[PDB]
Symmetry: C2
Subunit: 384 residues, 2 copies
């Protein structure tokens, strides 16, 4: 009844098609959009699922010349004698009502989000299960997207596990630190990560204009002397900051901060960026946190009078992150893997003791959110 056509007609000087469905609801489709999206082999390459029609071939003032229909299809003639057929279900799905458009966007982008503080129950799955079963890989990625983190247990205590998950997603994201990389204490460390020092809350790689969306960290070896992990939900903290201190929020979401990274690892590099620490979309929703205090530059491109207020804002923001209501602490063991949203979470670690042998070793990697979402879309379809 809902996707069965009861009536189709051209309206509004034939610039619009209206469908009355059998459930009595109505949908409207501009004529230019219909012509633009003609599925015939002239206009549309089915093997690629892509449009061949050029913008240059589209009359933006086009009207429908003729229309007939049955319960399942509309058949249209155009002023220049082009001919088009559209299927009822295809039409129904693309209805321009706010409700139909929003529903489809949810299905494409999995916007569901569950904010958390210290009460977090760390979502946890088995590693081999995730590699083997789509049902488990689906739960893995959907929870990663919704909650921002998933732990995987039962991996080995050897290099190569993040690489297997990378393949399960599709491919990992290559950076100047390599395809994968080793978090251990190193002589002449090119990065504070590669020391025994404390890492306060940070996102990885704000020195890139497109920081890694997803981070993977696998504990190969762990020390008893320290090295606990800490996470906080950045979207949650930002919401509390806007509430408690709209001025601090305003400064952090509007000020461009310079980040830097110079050194040699996979290649030799001299990397520079600018980002707003709290990054808002066009509707004012926080979509990314860009913040690592180690790689924030000495160069600070703001007028002198904006400097101290910036720091006072940043301090309020860091204090919220450290608050006992926001922060969640745990300690990784050999064979544990954490996979998390590096645009949303900030993470850190406690200091631990140097010695003459390596007491602590994680292997990490990155992946692009688009690569991950693509796998998520495919998995959902296979599972449903």
């Amino acid at each position: 009844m809902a996707c069965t056509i009861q009536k189709a007609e051209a309206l509004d000087g034939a610039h619009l098609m209206q469908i009355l469905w059998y459930d009595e609801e109505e949908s409207l489709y501009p004529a230019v959009w219909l012509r633009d999206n003609c599925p015939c082999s002239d206009c549309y390459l089915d093997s690629a699922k892509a449009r061949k029609l050029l913008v240059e071939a589209l009359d933006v003032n086009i009207g429908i010349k003729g229309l007939i229909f049955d319960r399942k299809k509309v058949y249209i003639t155009w002023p220049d004698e082009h001919y088009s057929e559209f299927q009822a279900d295809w039409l129904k799905k693309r209805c321009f009502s706010k409700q139909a458009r929003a529903k489809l966007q949810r299905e494409l982008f999995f916007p569901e989000c569950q904010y958390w503080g210290s009460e977090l129950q760390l979502p946890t799955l088995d590693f081999e299960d995730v590699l083997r079963y789509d049902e488990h890989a689906y739960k893995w990625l959907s929870t990663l997207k919704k909650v921002g983190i998933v732990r995987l247990t039962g991996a080995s205590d050897k290099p190569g596990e993040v690489s297997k998950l990378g393949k399960r997603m599709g491919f990992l994201y290559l950076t100047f630190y390599g395809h994968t990389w080793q978090v251990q204490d190193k002589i002449d460390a090119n990065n504070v990560a590669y020391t025994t020092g404390k890492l306060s809350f940070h996102t990885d790689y704000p020195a890139l204009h497109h920081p890694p969306g997803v981070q993977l960290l696998h504990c190969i070896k762990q020390t008893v002397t320290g090295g606990d992990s800490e996470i906080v939900d950045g979207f949650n903290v930002c919401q509390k900051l806007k509430k408690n201190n709209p001025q601090a929020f305003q400064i952090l979401s509007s000020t461009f901060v310079d980040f830097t990274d110079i050194g040699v690892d996979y290649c030799d590099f001299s990397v520079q960026s600018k980002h707003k620490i709290i990054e808002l979309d066009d509707k004012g929703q926080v979509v990314r946190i860009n913040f690592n205090n180690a790689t924030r530059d000495t160069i600070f491109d703001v007028p002198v009078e904006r400097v101290q207020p910036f720091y006072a804002a940043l301090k309020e923001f860091v204090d919220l992150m450290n608050s006992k209501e926001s922060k969640f602490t745990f300690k990784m063991n050999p064979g544990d893997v954490i996979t998390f949203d590096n645009w949303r979470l900030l993470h850190g670690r406690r200091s631990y003791e140097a010695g003459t042998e390596i007491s602590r070793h994680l292997e990490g990697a990155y992946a692009d959110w688009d690569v991950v979402m693509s796998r998520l879309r495919i998995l959902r379809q296979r599972v449903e």
Copy 2:
């Protein structure tokens, strides 16, 4: 005289340091910024060129407790007995005046830009020279950044040339179409690029939220039956559009368009995005064009009444691109490589004739702008 210290003092309740240089100019440095950027081994890890100091250790209300100086350094004591030394040249470079900050930004980001239309003289270098000499690789990347395109001649007529340039930059950008990819006519083409059809002006990969910054295309084999290349400077076209049709400009720079790509190539994929076709920074400057008509989705997430005005805007934009004053046409020969800014240029190709053997073959690859700029920074330093 300009970077020699004539006087240093604490001012403004000791919250500011003022330096009077020997050229009689003055610079101001907030106390909190100085403490934040103390270069001592407690605060700063020299092997990483990174800050160890935590935000949590920074008193945002800090003042200078004592200060002494000579011609080349300032020596500061802090209220908690921490001690800091700063070098005159380091200080001079980071001066918070608008002029000093802007100068340094130019040096970091190479903003110089030369807009062009049909009068373009295609910048051209030798391929092997670029692989061999830093002077030539520097000219290559600086011109790529400034002009948006460089041709390289004298490559071979065999696969693997884009890969060599990838290494010269650092590394190539892996996508679902592979590390490198073959533009040829293919049975069951997963993409309109892999046909003999005309490609109108487009950027590559707006189906990703972070489209490739730089594209490389190497002609292995060329057909006489068609297949000429066309380019246009997108930043130039946008400027003309804002002038001629501010309404069209407003629609294109504000409307989110959905892009899609579903198929199998390097991996199986189902990719979705949203972008504004004309993408503006926070000051209203165009920083990216995101537009491929083949991969623009059938799904169009706007209210019905915005649809036709969107198309009328897009048509004005495409017509400008096609104008004889904007467009530059040329034809690639075996051994030619084009490297260009895929955020700024749009490119296309003329149709050509199918046959039973492959008459036309290019190999392409992508690179990230951050990877390229890093190499650019390193090269400049080596050459100067």
